[PDB]
Structure 1
Amino acid sequence: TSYTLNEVVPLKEFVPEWVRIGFSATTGAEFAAHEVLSWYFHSELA
């Protein structure tokens, strides 16, 4: 089953030049366990 979402997001306008990337998950009154099983990342700045 696949779900796909696309959007023009001009990153330069919102984020500092140097960034940290990661994951976040929370619970409140209701809850679930949130887990990540593997991670791949690659970036290329010219």
Structure 2
Amino acid sequence: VTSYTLSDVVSLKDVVPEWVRIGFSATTGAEYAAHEVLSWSFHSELS
């Protein structure tokens, strides 16, 4: 079980609009690979 964690402060309020859409992106260029997602869950709560 190998694990990596990273964290930092992101003032979301100043970067993104009030409403957003979330998703995944993957690209290839001169070099490449297949990028796949097997499952996905999300939960948000705004008071």
Normalising by structure 2, what TM-score? Answer: 0.96
d(CA) in 1 for partners of 2:29, 2:7: 29
Instruction: Give the structure 1 partner of residue 16 of structure 2.
Output: 15
The runs of 5 or more residues in structure 1 that have no matched partner are: none
Q: C-alpha displacement at 1:17, in angstroms?
A: 0.1
Instruction: Give the structure 2 partner of residue 29 of structure 1.
Output: 30
Identity of aligned residues (%): 83
d(CA) in 1 for partners of 2:35, 2:19: 28
Normalising by structure 1, what TM-score? Answer: 0.98
The runs of 5 or more residues in structure 2 that have no matched partner are: none
> What per-residue deviation string (whole Å, max 9, x for no partner) do you get for residues 1-43 of structure 1?
0000010101000000000000000000000000000000000
Query: Match of 1:20, SS?
Result: strand
2:5 corresponds to which letter in structure 1?
T
